[PDB]
Amino acid sequence: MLYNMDERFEIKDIVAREVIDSRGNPTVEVEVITKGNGYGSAIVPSGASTGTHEALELRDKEKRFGGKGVLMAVENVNSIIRPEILGYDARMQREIDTIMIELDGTPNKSRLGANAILAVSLAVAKAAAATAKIPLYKYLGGFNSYVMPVPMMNVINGGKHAGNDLDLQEFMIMPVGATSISEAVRMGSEVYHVLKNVILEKYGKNAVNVGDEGGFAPPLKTSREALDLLTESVKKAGYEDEVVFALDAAASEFYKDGYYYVEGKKLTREELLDYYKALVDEYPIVSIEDPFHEEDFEGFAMITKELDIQIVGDDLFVTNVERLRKGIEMKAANALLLKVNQIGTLSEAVDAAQLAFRNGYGVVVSHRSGETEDTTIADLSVALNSGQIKTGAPARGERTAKYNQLIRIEQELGLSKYAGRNFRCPF
Amino acid sequence: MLYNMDERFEIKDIVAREVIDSRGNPTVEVEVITKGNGYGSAIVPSGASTGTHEALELRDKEKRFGGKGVLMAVENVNSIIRPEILGYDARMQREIDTIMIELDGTPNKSRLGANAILAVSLAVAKAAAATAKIPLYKYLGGFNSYVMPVPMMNVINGGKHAGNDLDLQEFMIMPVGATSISEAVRMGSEVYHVLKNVILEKYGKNAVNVGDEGGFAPPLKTSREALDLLTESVKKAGYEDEVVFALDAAASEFYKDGYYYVEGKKLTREELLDYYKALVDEYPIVSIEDPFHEEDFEGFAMITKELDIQIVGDDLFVTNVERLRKGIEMKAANALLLKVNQIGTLSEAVDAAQLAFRNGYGVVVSHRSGETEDTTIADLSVALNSGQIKTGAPARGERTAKYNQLIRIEQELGLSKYAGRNFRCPF
C-alpha cells in the first residue's frame, strides 16, 4: 500500500567496528541510522567459528588477539553487506536478512560470518523501531509483548573449567515465586550474596572469585553438595517458597566412549537417567538442560517422557531448525535454548522460536559465555513472551546489564505480567 | 546574549530508578530529556555511605538488598531534586550542580545522597550534549578534546579480599608503547590471556576465576612474585618494550599504629619507602598509588621527592579539592586519582582536575570496585585529555564497556592522539 511508503525508514548509513567482549576477545558491533534519524546499535556475543550445525562466526586467525580478531567480519559489513542494503526500507527485516543470507551463499553463514550478519540484523531492527518510535520489544513482537521472563541464574559453576570437581556445568536458581522482574532480580541478588558469604565462611576468602558468567566455583564434587549449598543459601535468604532450581548438565562434556563419568563412576544412559530422577525427587529442580550427549535424541525423548519437568535441548539443537524439527517429531526435550548468534539472523531466530512454541516447547532466550554490554536478549525475551531467560548470575556487567534492561522494560510497560510459575507458557 | 536563549535546552523531564551494579548491589540511574528531545542517561558506581572527608552515598539500610537499597536516593531525585530543576537550561551545568548542592545543604551531600546528586549531574550533561548535537567529550571538554588515555589494567589482585597473601592491592599493566587506544586495549587483552594461561599451567584450573575488577588472584605472597609473573607474561606476549607497570598499594589497608605490615614484616614509613624504591629499581614501575596511609601527607611528599615516578593520591585526597590543595602546597604526590562519585557533581570533579593539572599533577580518571554498564568516565578522560585512565582488567562487561567506548571515541575523532609514554602530560 502506497500509504505505508516512508522515506524515513530508508537506511542512510551502516558502520561496523571491532570491540571486545566480557572475556577480552574481539567481537562485532554494528551501527545503523535511517533517513528519519532512527538509530540502532548492536554488539553480538562471542560464538563459534567452527561447528557441525550452527551458524559460524568469521575469525581472522591472524597473530593479533590470539587469532580471534574480527576485522574480516567487520570489513564484510562495511564493504560487502553495506552497499547491498543502503537505502533499503529498514522495516523489511525479513527481506534484509534474506539479502544477507543469499549474499553469503552458504547454509551456515561461514563466508561473511554469522557475527557480521547478526550484528547488522539486530542493528537494523533497532533502527527501524527507533524510527517508528515504538519500544523495541513492541516492534519485535507486536503490541502484545508484555511478559517479563523468569531468570535462570547460574550461581554455582561446574564442569572442567569451573575449577572444582563438579560434573554438571550449571546450577541455577529461578525466582518463579517473585511477583515482578524487579523482585526476581532482587531475590536472585540476595540469594547470590547469602551464597557468597556461606562459601566464604565455609571455604575461605580464596573461594569467592567468579567464573565467566558471574557464578561461584566452590570446592565441591557431587551434585547433591552443590544443590545442598543452594538450598542452604535460598533458605537463609528467605526465599525457600519462591525459588526453584534449574540445571544445565551439558552432559556431552562428561560423556565418552559410551559412558557418562559422574562423581567417579561410569554410568550408562539409563543409570544417568535414574541419577537425574533421584535429584528431581530430592530437590525442586524444574528444568534440566542437555541431560545427555548432543546426539542422543532417543535419550532426550526417554527423560522427557519419564520426568514431568522441562527438558531443554541446547547442544542437542544448537538453535538449528532442522535439528529442532527432528526433536519435535521424536518428542525429544520440550524446550529450546535459543542462542541468536547460533542461527545468524533475527528472522531465523524468531522462526525457530515460533516452531518451538507451536509444538508445545518452551523457549529459553540465552546469553553466551562471552557476552557484551548489549542488552538485546532482554527485549527479545519480552517480545517473544518467552517466560524465561538465561543470562547469568546477578554479577558482572555483561550480565547485570540485561537485568537492568528487564527492569527498565517492566517499568516502561504500563501493565506487565511476570511469567512466574507459568514460565513455560505464560498465557 | 538573547540569541543564546533556546527553549530546546529546557529540562522537560527527569526520572530516577534503582538498578543493580556489577556486584549485584543497588545503585541509582537517572534519565533526563530536554524539550528539544535531547536524551541523557547515567548510572553511578558504588561509593561509601560513611566517611568524614568524601561525599556520602545514601543507602536505605532496610532488610532488602542487605540494607544496600537506594530507593530513598531515587525518591530524592524524583520528588526533591526534580521539581527544582524542571524547565532549567540544561547547558547551565554549574548552576544545576550548585542548586543540588545547596538543596542538600550538607558538606558531604549526606542528606539527599551523593549517588542521587551525581546521577542527575551526569544525566543532565549528557542531555545537554545530545541537544546541542556535540559529542559528549567535546561538550564536556570543549573542541580540543582528542587525547586517548593510557589504560592502567588491574590484572593481578592483592589485598585482604583478593584471596591470596599479596599485601598490595593492584598490580597493573600500562601499554604506554601502543600507538592508539585500540592497540592499547589489544595489547592489554593479549597480555591478560597469556597471564591466564601461565597461571593455569603453574597453579591449576582452579586458579583463574576473577575478582571484582576482572583481574586474577594467583596464590602469591610477595610483590616480587606478582611482578615476576607480569614480567613473564609481558615477555611471552612480546611486549617487553611497550608495556610498563603501575601499582596501587592502598597502604592504609595494611597500616596500624605507626607500622605497615608487609610480607610478614613490620615496617616504618621510611622502611616501606625503601621497599617501594627497591621494586621500582628492579621493575619498570612508572606509577604507585597510595604508597602510604590516607593521612600521611608528609610521607607522600617524601616518596614523591625521593623517587622519579608518578605518585598517585587516592585515599589521601578522596577527590576533595581542599585535601588536594593541601597536598599541592606540601608537594605530596604528583597525581590525583579522580573518582567523580567521591565528590558528587561533574562541576566539582572537573574543578578538582583543573586544580591538579594546573599545578603539575597528573589526573587518573578512575572507576570504582562496583561498576555499571555506564561509560561516562571514558568520555570524561578524553574531555579532560587526562592521558590516563584506570578502569579494570580487559574482562567483565562493566570494565570492557569503557574500553569499547574509548575505541568508539577514538574512531569518531578521526585525528586523535594516544598519550603513550607522555601519559602524565600529553601536550
UniProtKB/Swiss-Prot annotation, chains A, B:
Alphabetical list of Gene3D superfamilies matching this protein: Enolase-like C-terminal domain, Enolase-like, N-terminal domain
Activity control: The covalent binding to the substrate causes inactivation of the enzyme, and possibly serves as a signal for the export of the protein.
Cofactor annotation: Mg(2+)
Pathway terms, separated by semicolons: Carbohydrate degradation; glycolysis; pyruvate from D-glyceraldehyde 3-phosphate: step 4/5
Keywords per UniProt: Cytoplasm, Glycolysis, Lyase, Magnesium, Metal-binding, Secreted
Cofactor binding note of this UniProt entry: Binds a second Mg(2+) ion via substrate during catalysis.
Protein name: Enolase
Gene designation per UniProt: eno
